[PDB]
Design a protein around this ligand. Structure first.
Ligand SMILES: *[C@@H]1O[C@H](CO)[C@@H](O[C@@H]2O[C@H](CO)[C@@H](O[C@@H]3O[C@H](CO[C@H]4O[C@H](CO)[C@@H](O)[C@H](O)[C@@H]4O)[C@@H](O)[C@H](O[C@H]4O[C@H](CO)[C@@H](O)[C@H](O)[C@@H]4O)[C@@H]3O)[C@H](O)[C@H]2NC(C)=O)[C@H](O)[C@H]1NC(C)=O
Ligand SMILES: *[C@@H]1O[C@H](CO[C@@H]2O[C@@H](C)[C@@H](O)[C@@H](O)[C@@H]2O)[C@@H](O[C@@H]2O[C@H](CO)[C@@H](O[C@@H]3O[C@H](CO[C@H]4O[C@H](CO)[C@@H](O)[C@H](O)[C@@H]4O)[C@@H](O)[C@H](O)[C@@H]3O)[C@H](O)[C@H]2NC(C)=O)[C@H](O)[C@H]1NC(C)=O
Ligand SMILES: *[C@@H]1O[C@H](CO[C@@H]2O[C@@H](C)[C@@H](O)[C@@H](O)[C@@H]2O)[C@@H](O[C@@H]2O[C@H](CO)[C@@H](O)[C@H](O)[C@H]2NC(C)=O)[C@H](O)[C@H]1NC(C)=O
Ligand SMILES: *[C@@H]1O[C@H](CO)[C@@H](O[C@@H]2O[C@H](CO)[C@@H](O)[C@H](O)[C@H]2NC(C)=O)[C@H](O)[C@H]1NC(C)=O
Ligand SMILES: *[C@@H]1O[C@H](CO)[C@@H](O[C@@H]2O[C@H](CO)[C@@H](O)[C@H](O)[C@H]2NC(C)=O)[C@H](O)[C@H]1NC(C)=O
Ligand SMILES: *[C@@H]1O[C@H](CO)[C@@H](O[C@@H]2O[C@H](CO)[C@@H](O)[C@H](O)[C@H]2NC(C)=O)[C@H](O)[C@H]1NC(C)=O
Ligand SMILES: *[C@@H]1O[C@H](CO)[C@@H](O[C@@H]2O[C@H](CO)[C@@H](O)[C@H](O)[C@H]2NC(C)=O)[C@H](O)[C@H]1NC(C)=O
Ligand SMILES: *[C@@H]1O[C@H](CO)[C@@H](O[C@@H]2O[C@H](CO)[C@@H](O)[C@H](O)[C@H]2NC(C)=O)[C@H](O)[C@H]1NC(C)=O
Ligand SMILES: *[C@@H]1O[C@H](CO)[C@@H](O)[C@H](O)[C@H]1NC(C)=O
Ligand SMILES: *[C@@H]1O[C@H](CO)[C@@H](O)[C@H](O)[C@H]1NC(C)=O
Ligand SMILES: *[C@@H]1O[C@H](CO)[C@@H](O)[C@H](O)[C@H]1NC(C)=O
Ligand SMILES: *[C@@H]1O[C@H](CO)[C@@H](O)[C@H](O)[C@H]1NC(C)=O
Ligand SMILES: *[C@@H]1O[C@H](CO)[C@@H](O)[C@H](O)[C@H]1NC(C)=O
Ligand SMILES: *[C@@H]1O[C@H](CO)[C@@H](O)[C@H](O)[C@H]1NC(C)=O
Ligand SMILES: *[C@@H]1O[C@H](CO)[C@@H](O)[C@H](O)[C@H]1NC(C)=O
Ligand SMILES: *[C@@H]1O[C@H](CO)[C@@H](O)[C@H](O)[C@H]1NC(C)=O
Ligand SMILES: *[C@@H]1O[C@H](CO)[C@@H](O)[C@H](O)[C@H]1NC(C)=O
Ligand SMILES: *[C@@H]1O[C@H](CO)[C@@H](O)[C@H](O)[C@H]1NC(C)=O
Ligand SMILES: *[C@@H]1O[C@H](CO)[C@@H](O)[C@H](O)[C@H]1NC(C)=O
Ligand SMILES: *[C@@H]1O[C@H](CO)[C@@H](O)[C@H](O)[C@H]1NC(C)=O
Ligand SMILES: *[C@@H]1O[C@H](CO)[C@@H](O)[C@H](O)[C@H]1NC(C)=O
Ligand SMILES: *[C@@H]1O[C@H](CO)[C@@H](O)[C@H](O)[C@H]1NC(C)=O
Ligand SMILES: *[C@@H]1O[C@H](CO)[C@@H](O)[C@H](O)[C@H]1NC(C)=O
Ligand SMILES: *[C@@H]1O[C@H](CO)[C@@H](O)[C@H](O)[C@H]1NC(C)=O
Ligand SMILES: *[C@@H]1O[C@H](CO)[C@@H](O)[C@H](O)[C@H]1NC(C)=O
Ligand SMILES: *[C@@H]1O[C@H](CO)[C@@H](O)[C@H](O)[C@H]1NC(C)=O
Ligand SMILES: *[C@@H]1O[C@H](CO)[C@@H](O)[C@H](O)[C@H]1NC(C)=O
Ligand SMILES: *[C@@H]1O[C@H](CO)[C@@H](O)[C@H](O)[C@H]1NC(C)=O
Ligand SMILES: *[C@@H]1O[C@H](CO)[C@@H](O)[C@H](O)[C@H]1NC(C)=O
Ligand SMILES: *[C@@H]1O[C@H](CO)[C@@H](O)[C@H](O)[C@H]1NC(C)=O
Ligand SMILES: *[C@@H]1O[C@H](CO)[C@@H](O)[C@H](O)[C@H]1NC(C)=O
Ligand SMILES: *[C@@H]1O[C@H](CO)[C@@H](O)[C@H](O)[C@H]1NC(C)=O
Lengths: 191, 142, 187, 185, 142, 142
C-alpha cells in the first residue's frame, strides 16, 4: 500500500461541469447524439440518424453570413469542425440549412478512404470521451472509420441536461482547434 | 509555441473539484509546472486559473478561448493521448490524477495521470514502475 | 535602490528602432492614428475617422493581384490584418480602393457582437501603447469613431507619443488564420 | 582515436529508407530534378525544365475534386506545396491539367522578386538536399518552368540520400504569408 | 512548436539601448535563455541577434521574419501579455527591464521586464516581492 | 506545441542503420530528451519510435504524420537548420551524428549532429571546440 513507508498515495478528481461558461464542453448520450455545450444555456446536437431532414443539395452559406440572424459562437464551433475535417474534397455530400438563424448541417456518409472516414474522425475527436460507442471502427483502425448510421446532423439546441453516458469534457474540442486548416485541399489558384 | 500562463497563488476547492474539498498544493510542488512541458496537471490548473480570472474580472463569448488555446494549454499532449487511444495503449482522459503524499510535513509530488486501459481505471499493479520512479525520485531532496 | 546591501537595480530601456530593417515597427502618434513603418520605405497608416474616403462597396482585390502594382510588404501586412479579425461575417463592411498599387481600405463601423467589435478588437493589438486610451470589457467593445481607414504613407516622425516596437504585429502572425468562418462549402 | 582523455570520437549515421512507410521521402538525383516518394509504390516528380508539357492555362480543380479519380496523398502533397508559397499573386502562373487522376501540374517561372522567387523558395525547402548563398530576395533559377507529376516508384535516386525533413518543414508554414483574395473568407 | 534559436556572440551594444551604454551580461546568466520559456528579455534578445545577423551578412521583405518569428520569440508569450493587458492586472511593455547587479564581483541575474499598468510603471513597490525572490535565487547561485 | 511523444524502452536496430551492429544507448543518455528543446537526436529517436509503433501496432496515407508533427518534433528546429543553411554557416542534414562512449563503461554523451558545409561534411577542426565543451560538461557530470 504505502511505498517506502512514509509516502502514501492520494488521488485528485476533477469536476469538468464548472467549465461551461469559459469554454465549450462535450458529452455523450443515447449512443448517437453526443451533445455539446457552448455555454450555460444553448449548444449543438451532433446526432447520427438514418433519417434525412435537408433534402436539398444547397447551403446558401454566404446568404447566412449576410443575414446574420444566427448566433456567432455556434457557427464558430461549426467552422472549427469544418476546417478540422482532414482531406475534405466532395461538396455535394454536406447539405446545410442556416435559414432563420438555425444552425443545421447534414454530412452525408454514404473503399474507406472517403469523406465519411474524415468526418467521423473529426466527430470522435470532438466528442473524445464516449465516442467509441458510435464507431464500429476497431482498435488502431484510423484508416477506415465506419458507422451503421448514414448521416451526421449538427443541430442548434437548448441544453436541458443531456449528459447521460459520459461526463462533461472540453478536451476533444480544445485539442481540435489546432487541426483547423491543417489538412485541407486547395480549391482555387489564388486562394 | 509553448505554454506561458502563470499559475496564481494553486489550491483548489469544491467549487472546482468533485469530491474532495480544499485540496491545497505546496508552492514548491506546483513550481515544477514552469519547467516541465509534457504533463496534464499543468494544463488543468492553467484552465482553472483563467476560469477564475474570466468569471471574475470580466463580463459566453468563445473568442477569448479561440485565441489563447496554445498559450493556456498544450494541445499536442491532448493529440498524443488521442493517438494513444487509437493505438489502445493506456491513455489519460484528463479525469483522475494520482500523486504521493506524506503527513509528516505534507510534501507532495506534482500529480501525474491515472492512466485508463480497459475503459476502467488501471489498477496500481500495472503502473507500479512509474509510481516507484516518482517515489525514489522524491527521496532526492538533498 | 539598496536591496540586501549588496545589490542594486539598473534599468534597461531598449531602443527599438534597430529592428526597423528586419520586421515592421508599430507607433501611435495620436490617440487614434496608429502607424506601421516597415522601414524608411512607405508604410501603413491606420486611422479612425468619421470622414469617408471610399464611398463605394466594391473591393476589386483579385484585379489588384492581377495588375500587381502594390508593394508586397504592405499587402502582406494588410492581408495579415484582414485575416486576423476574430469573427468576420459581413462582407459589406470592407471596401477597398486599389489603383496603381495604392493601398486604401475602409471598415464601416456602425449593439454588440458585430463586425465593428472584431475589427476594432484586432485594431487595438497593432500596438499596445496608445490604443487603449482610444479594461472592464474587451470582447464586447466599441468606439464612437465611425470608420477605420487604412492607407499607405511615407515615413515621417510619426512616433512622438508611443515608443516604436514590433510586439503587436509579431503577436498577430500566429493569429492570422486562427479564427475564420467558413464562407464556402469546399475551402 | 582519443580526443580528450579517455573519450573517443565515434559516429553513427541513420538509415532513412527504413522510414519509407509513414511519410514522404525526398531525393535529388541530378542538378535539376528532385523527387518525392510516398512509400515504395508511387511518388511525385518535381522537374525543372525549359519545355512546357501542358499549354492551356486552365486549372479545373473543383472538377478534379468532384471526379475523385486521384490519389489522396499525392494531391495532398501538392496542396501543401501550393499553399506554402510565400506570396502567390499572379494567379495565372499555375497550370494544373487534372484528368483521370493525372497530377501533371505546372508552374510558370517567367528588378526581381516575382512569383518565381517564391516558387523556387518552396522548391528548395521541399527537396532540401541538392537544391543548389547570400541571395534570398531573388533566387531566380535559370530554368523556365517547374512541373509536378505522379510517377510509379523505382530506383529514381542515388545522388542525394532520402529524407523527410524538407516535407516536415513545409508541412508547417502552410498558411503564412498568403495574400487575401476574397473579401470575406 | 517551441522556439529553438540559439543566440550567437551575450554582450549588449550601445545602439540597441536608448541611453548609449556598454551594457554586458555574463554567459552564466544568459545561458538560462536556452532552457527557460516564459522570459521576455530572452525573446527580445533573440530578435535583436536575428536582426543583427540579417542586417549584417544577408542582403525590405517581410516573409523572412514572418516565417522565422517562432524560432526567435514564443508568440504565446505575446498572447499571455495581451491576456494580462485586457484584465486590469499589470502587463509587460517589453520596453523597460530590470535586474540586480552585484557591483563587487560583477555577476548579474537574468533581467525581467518591468511591468506597466495604466500607462505608468510600478515604482518598486507592487513587485518588490518578485525582486526579493530573484535575490534569493541569486543567493542560491552562491 | 512541444515534444510530448515519449520514447519506448531505447535501442536502435540493425535495419535502422547502415554499417551498424545494434548500437544502443543508456537510459541516462536519453533521459535529457524529455527536457532538451534543440536536440536533433531526440527528434530522430521520437520519429523512428512512432514509426515502430505505427507498423507494429497501427494497421498508405499521410494523415497520421500530418496530425502528429508538432507533438513529435518541434518544426522550428528544421526551420532553424534551413535558416542556417541560407546564412551560409554550417547547418545540419540530420544524417551523420557523433558521440563519445567512455572506454571503461557504456555511459555515453548525448549525440549532437555532424555539421555540413556547402554539400560537404565539416572538418573535425572547426567544431573541435564544441567537442571540448561537450567533454568538459561530461566530466562535470561525473
Ligand atoms: C475517463 O475514464 C474514466 C474511466 O472510464 C471515467 O470514469 C467513470 O466514468 C463512468 C461514466 O459512466 C462512471 O460511470 C457511472 O458512475 C456512476 C457512479 O457510480 C456509482 O454507482 C456505482 C455502481 O457500481 C458504484 O460502484 C459507485 O461507487 C457509485 O456509487 C454510476 O451511478 C453510473 O451507473 C448508474 O448510475 C447512472 C446514473 O444514476 C444510471 O443512469 C445507470 O443506469 C446506473 O444505475 C455509472 O456507472 C464511473 O463511475 C466513472 N468512474 C470509474 C469507475 O471509472 C471518467 O468519467 C472518464 N472521464 C472523461 C472526461 O472521459
Ligand atoms: C442506417 O442505414 C444503413 C444503410 O442501409 C442502407 O441504406 C438504407 C437507407 C436502406 O436502404 C438499407 O436497406 C440499406 O442497406 C444501415 O446499415 C445496414 O445495416 C445492415 C444490418 O443492420 C447491413 O446488412 C448487411 O447484411 C448483409 C447480408 O445480407 C443480409 O440479408 C440477407 C438476406 O435476408 C441475410 O441472409 C443476411 O444474413 C443479411 O441479413 C451483409 O452482407 C452486409 O455486409 C451487411 O451486414 C447493411 O449492409 C447496412 N448497410 C446500409 C447501407 O445500411 C443501418 O443499419 C441503418 N441504421 C439502423 C439503426 O438501422
Ligand atoms: C439556396 O440558394 C438557392 C439559389 O438562390 C440564389 O442565391 C440566393 C442566395 C438568392 O440570392 C437567390 O435569389 C438566388 O437565386 C435557392 O434556390 C432558389 O430557390 C428559389 C425559391 O424556390 C427559386 O426561385 C430559384 O430559382 C432557386 N435557384 C436555384 C439556382 O436553384 C435556394 O432556395 C436557397 N435555399 C435556401 C434554404 O434559402
Ligand atoms: C456553469 O458553471 C458554473 C461555474 O463556471 C457553475 O457554478 C456557478 O458559477 C457562478 C459563476 O459563474 C457562481 O456564481 C455560482 O455560485 C456557481 N454555482 C455553483 C452551484 O457552483 C454553474 O452552476 C454551471 N451551470 C449549470 C447550469 O450547471
Ligand atoms: C484489457 O482487457 C483484456 C481482456 O481482459 C486484457 O487482456 C489480457 O490481459 C491479461 C492480464 O493478465 C494478459 O495476461 C493477457 O495476455 C491479455 N490478453 C490479450 C488478448 O491481450 C488486457 O490486459 C486489459 N488491459 C490492461 C490490463 O491494460
Ligand atoms: C534603422 O536601423 C539601422 C540599424 O538596423 C540604423 O542604422 C544605424 O544608424 C546609426 C545612426 O547613428 C549608425 O551609427 C549605425 O552605424 C547604423 N547601422 C547600420 C547597420 O547601418 C538606422 O539608423 C535606423 N533608422 C531609423 C530611422 O531608425
Ligand atoms: C475545364 O473547364 C473549362 C470550362 O470552360 C473547359 O473549357 C472548354 O472545354 C471544352 C471541352 O470540350 C472545349 O471544347 C472548349 O473549347 C473549352 N472552352 C474554351 C473557352 O476553350 C475545359 O475543357 C475544362 N478542362 C480543362 C483541362 O481545362
Ligand atoms: C554592474 O556594475 C558594474 C560596476 O559598475 C559594471 O561594470 C562596468 O562595466 C562597464 C561596461 O559594461 C565598464 O565600462 C565599467 O568600467 C565597469 N565598471 C567597473 C567598476 O568595473 C557592470 O557592467 C554592471 N553590469 C551590468 C550587467 O549592468
Ligand atoms: C434516443 O435514440 C432513439 C433512437 O435514435 C431516438 O428515437 C430518441 O428520440 C433518442 N432520444 C434522445 C432525445 O436521446
Ligand atoms: C445559468 O443558467 C441557469 C439555468 O438556466 C440560470 O438560472 C442562470 O441565470 C444562468 N446564469 C448563471 C451565470 O447562472
Ligand atoms: C436554433 O434552435 C432552436 C431550437 O431548435 C430554435 O428555437 C431556433 O429557432 C434556432 N435558431 C435560433 C434563432 O435560435
Ligand atoms: C446521400 O448519398 C447517397 C449516396 O448513395 C445518395 O443516394 C443520397 O441521396 C444522399 N442523400 C442526401 C440527403 O443527400
Ligand atoms: C496531504 O495530506 C495532508 C493530511 O493532512 C493534507 O493536509 C494535504 O492537503 C495533502 N496533500 C494534498 C496535495 O492534498
Ligand atoms: C489491484 O490488484 C490487486 C492484486 O490483484 C488487488 O488485490 C486489488 O484489489 C486491485 N485493486 C486495487 C485498487 O488495489
Ligand atoms: C491627430 O493628429 C492630427 C495631425 O495629424 C492633429 O491635428 C490632431 O490634433 C491630432 N489629435 C486628435 C484629432 O485628437
Ligand atoms: C532610409 O533608407 C534609404 C534607403 O537605403 C536611405 O536612402 C535613407 O537615407 C534612409 N534614411 C532616412 C530616409 O532617414
Ligand atoms: C456604413 O453603413 C451604414 C449603414 O446604415 C451607412 O449608413 C453608411 O453610409 C455606411 N458607410 C459607407 C462608407 O458606405
Ligand atoms: C470594380 O470592378 C467593377 C466590375 O464591375 C467595376 O464596375 C468598378 O468600377 C470597379 N471599381 C473600381 C473602384 O475600380
Ligand atoms: C512603454 O513605455 C513607454 C515609456 O515612454 C510608453 O511611452 C509606452 O506607451 C509604453 N507602452 C505600453 C504598451 O505600455
Ligand atoms: C462621429 O460620429 C459619431 C456618430 O454620430 C459621433 O458619436 C462622434 O462624436 C463623431 N465624431 C468623431 C470624432 O468620432
Ligand atoms: C501609396 O503608394 C502609391 C504607389 O503608386 C504611391 O503613388 C502613393 O503616393 C502612396 N501614397 C502616399 C500617401 O504616399
Ligand atoms: C519499407 O518499409 C518496410 C516496413 O517498415 C521496411 O522493412 C523496408 O525495409 C522498407 N523498404 C525500403 C526499400 O525502404
Ligand atoms: C537530369 O536528369 C536527366 C534524366 O533524363 C539527365 O538526362 C540529365 O543529365 C540530368 N541533368 C541535367 C538536366 O542537368
Ligand atoms: C512495398 O512494401 C509493401 C509492404 O507491405 C509490400 O507489400 C509491397 O509489395 C512493396 N512494393 C514494392 C513495389 O516493392
Ligand atoms: C499517374 O496516374 C494515372 C492515373 O492513375 C496513371 O494512369 C499513370 O500511369 C500515373 N503515372 C503517370 C506518369 O502519369
Ligand atoms: C509563361 O509566361 C510567359 C510570359 O511571362 C509566356 O510567354 C509563356 O507562354 C508562359 N508559359 C506557360 C503558361 O507554359
Ligand atoms: C488611470 O489613470 C487615469 C488618468 O486619467 C485615471 O483617471 C484613472 O482613475 C486611473 N485608473 C486607475 C484604476 O488607477
Ligand atoms: C515612485 O516614484 C514616484 C514619482 O512621483 C513617487 O511619488 C513615489 O513615491 C515612488 N514610490 C512608490 C510609488 O512606491
Ligand atoms: C561504447 O564504446 C565502445 C568502445 O569499443 C563502442 O564499441 C560502442 O559503440 C560504444 N557504445 C555506445 C552505446 O556508445
Ligand atoms: C564552401 O563551398 C566551396 C565550393 O567551392 C568549398 O570549396 C568550400 O570548402 C566550402 N566551405 C567553405 C567553408 O568555404
Ligand atoms: C547530408 O549532407 C550530405 C552532403 O554530402 C548529403 O549527401 C546528404 O543527403 C545529407 N543528408 C540528408 C539530406 O539526409
Ligand atoms: C581536416 O583538417 C586537418 C588539419 O590538420 C587535416 O589533416 C584533415 O585531413 C582534414 N580532413 C578530414 C579530417 O577529413
Amino acid at each position: 500500500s504505502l511505498y517506502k513507508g512514509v509516502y502514501e498515495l492520494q488521488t485528485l478528481e476533477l469536476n469538468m461541469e464548472t467549465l461551461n461558461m469559459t469554454m465549450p464542453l462535450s458529452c455523450t448520450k443515447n449512443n448517437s447524439h453526443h451533445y455539446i455545450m457552448v455555454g450555460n444555456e444553448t449548444g449543438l446536437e451532433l446526432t447520427l440518424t438514418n433519417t434525412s431532414i435537408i433534402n436539398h443539395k444547397f447551403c446558401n452559406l454566404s446568404d447566412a453570413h449576410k443575414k446574420n440572424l444566427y448566433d456567432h459562437a455556434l457557427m464558430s464551433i461549426i467552422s472549427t469542425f469544418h476546417l478540422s475535417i482532414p482531406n475534405f474534397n466532395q461538396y455535394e455530400a454536406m447539405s446545410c440549412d442556416f435559414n432563420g438563424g438555425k444552425i443545421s448541417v447534414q454530412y452525408n456518409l454514404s473503399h474507406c478512404g472517403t469523406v465519411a472516414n474524415g468526418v467521423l474522425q473529426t466527430f470522435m475527436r470532438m466528442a473524445w470521451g464516449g465516442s467509441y460507442i458510435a464507431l464500429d471502427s476497431g482498435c488502431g483502425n484510423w484508416d477506415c472509420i465506419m458507422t451503421s448510421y448514414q448521416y451526421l446532423i449538427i443541430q442548434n439546441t437548448t441544453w436541458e441536461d443531456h449528459c447521460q453516458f459520459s461526463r462533461p469534457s472540453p478536451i476533444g474540442y480544445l485539442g481540435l482547434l489546432s487541426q483547423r486548416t491543417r489538412d485541407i485541399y486547395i480549391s482555387r489558384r489564388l486562394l | 509555441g509553448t505554454f506561458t500562463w502563470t499559475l496564481s497563488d494553486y489550491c483548489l476547492t469544491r467549487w472546482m473539484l468533485i469530491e474532495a474539498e480544499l485540496k491545497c498544493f505546496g508552492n514548491t510542488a506546483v513550481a515544477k509546472c514552469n519547467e516541465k512541458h509534457d504533463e496534464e496537471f499543468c494544463d488543468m490548473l492553467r484552465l482553472f486559473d483563467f476560469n477564475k480570472q474570466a468569471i471574475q474580472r470580466l463580463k459566453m463569448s468563445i473568442q477569448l478561448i479561440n485565441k489563447a488555446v496554445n498559450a493556456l494549454i498544450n494541445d499536442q499532449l491532448i493529440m498524443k493521448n488521442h493517438l494513444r487511444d487509437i493505438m489502445c495503449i493506456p491513455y489519460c482522459n484528463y479525469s483522475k490524477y494520482w500523486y504521493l503524499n506524506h503527513t509528516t510535513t505534507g510534501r507532495t509530488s506534482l500529480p501525474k495521470c491515472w492512466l485508463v486501459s480497459n475503459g476502467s481505471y488501471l489498477n496500481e499493479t500495472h503502473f507500479s514502475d512509474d509510481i516507484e520512479q516518482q517515489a525514489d525520485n522524491m527521496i532526492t531532496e538533498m
